[PDB]
Amino acid sequence: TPKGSSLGTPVNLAVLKLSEQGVLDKLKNKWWYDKGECGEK
Amino acid sequence: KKWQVTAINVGNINNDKKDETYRSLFQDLELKKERRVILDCERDKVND
């Protein structure tokens, strides 16, 4: 965010909140692994 | 009482402006995460 913006604190608390409730892990596992190509004998 | 109070004057606003200033105000309240509000107004302004 630009310096002295009104969005700084809200986005900070936003990233924290989204991190603690496990959303980031979900999106990470969504766009990296779950959609991956590579997954007998 | 160690209260943190954000006092806003809603008194002077143009009727043409109307909803727009209110939108700005309540959005600014939402970014501050203020979930508690006291109106302090006559019935008309309260209705608005």
The 3-state DSSP composition of chain B as helix, strand, coil percent (nearest 5) reads 40, 0, 60
Q: Could you give the count of Cα atoms lying within 13 Å of A22 in the half-sphere of its Cβ?
A: 2
Residue A6: closest CA among B10, B21, B32: B32
**Technique used by the depositors:** X-ray
Could you tell me the sign of the dihedral formed by the alpha carbons of B44, B45, B47, B48, in that order? positive
Do the Cβ atoms of B33 and A13 come within 8 Å? yes
Q: Which residue of B has its CA nearest to A10?
A: B31
Whether B12 and B40 have beta carbons less than 8 Å apart is answered as no
Interface test with A, best of B31, B34, B35 (most A CBs within 10 A): B31
Please state the separation of Cα A17 from the chain's center in Å: 10
Q: Which residue of B has its CA nearest to A14?
A: B31
CA B36 to each of CA A7, B6, B10, B29: distance values in angstroms, whole numbers, following the listed order: 20, 11, 16, 10
Q: Could you give the count of Cα atoms lying within 13 Å of A40 in the half-sphere of its Cβ?
A: 0
Do the Cβ atoms of B28 and A10 come within 8 Å? no
**Distance of alpha carbon B18 from alpha carbon A17, whole angstroms:** 34
Token representation of residue B46: 């309260």
**Single-letter code of the amino acid located at B24:** S
Q: What's this structure's resolution in Å?
A: 3.3
Three-class SS state of B42: coil
